[PDB]
Design a protein around this ligand. Sequence first.
Ligand SMILES: Nc1ncnc2c1ncn2[C@@H]1O[C@H](COP(=O)(O)OP(=O)(O)NP(=O)(O)O)[C@@H](O)[C@H]1O
Length: 279
Amino acid sequence: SLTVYKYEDLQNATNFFSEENKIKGSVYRASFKGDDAAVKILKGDVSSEINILKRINHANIIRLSGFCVYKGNTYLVYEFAENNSLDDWLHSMCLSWFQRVQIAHDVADALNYLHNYANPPHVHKNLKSGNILLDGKFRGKVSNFGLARVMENEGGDEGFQLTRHVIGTQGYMAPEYIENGLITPKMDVFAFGVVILELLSGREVVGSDQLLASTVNQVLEGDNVREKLRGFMDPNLRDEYPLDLAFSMAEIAKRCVARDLNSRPNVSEVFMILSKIQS
Ligand SMILES: Nc1ncnc2c1ncn2[C@@H]1O[C@H](COP(=O)(O)OP(=O)(O)NP(=O)(O)O)[C@@H](O)[C@H]1O
């Protein structure tokens, strides 16, 4: 039943939605009850979707405190994630090697829960650096896994950024989806592969137009792999990383970004890999 909220308490926490808003028009910061939160405004009663998706709770998934339906709109209150999104940090203090490995581990931990032990399993479909939030200890918190996906919303929209949805599509989406709409948990594995590549290189998923998911193959192929990998590594790490474990992590990302979905590993395997190379 989560926690039923009175719309009043939401107005006061958000200063009556007084450009206390985070970037997203529907995303506001609510300061109240000591622990801060984030309020997302959604059109129409989406209560039915919550009663299904509310099954998904995990330490590394953005937690839903509750919801409120007021005058034809649904206001959802999530745990506030200070330090914003991984994209902000990778494309802007800099995340150390330890932190980058921790974040990859939390995401693999959440993807492992979603694909196997969520009752029933659920495919994310929208795993991106911008959706992976961080908390005060820079731990991962997956977010836009439902109802915020482009065509998952029952109430369609025309306040839509086409060029932006398409940029993320080419950089994160697996080929079997772009070509046939084939939706399997392997598409999350492909996306998760690109995230790791972002964590290792800090590069844009689509650079200035080469995709970050095709460069890892050239970096690990042929000869002089050590030198090509050093150059691939994020400069901001400044040698403060074990090149051995970086190559290993880059290897598990290449398998994740393979074109054949059945060749890709299950996230459960990636979760076991990241846990053994962790501190
Ligand atoms: N629970 C939360 N805690 C803190 N910040 C949040 C939370 N949910 C969303 N945000 C912020 O709200 C913005 C994104 O809102 P969102 O509804 O996810 O749309 P979005 O634009 O698709 N996400 P993004 O990929 O980062 O641009 C980002 O600046 C996030 O940091």
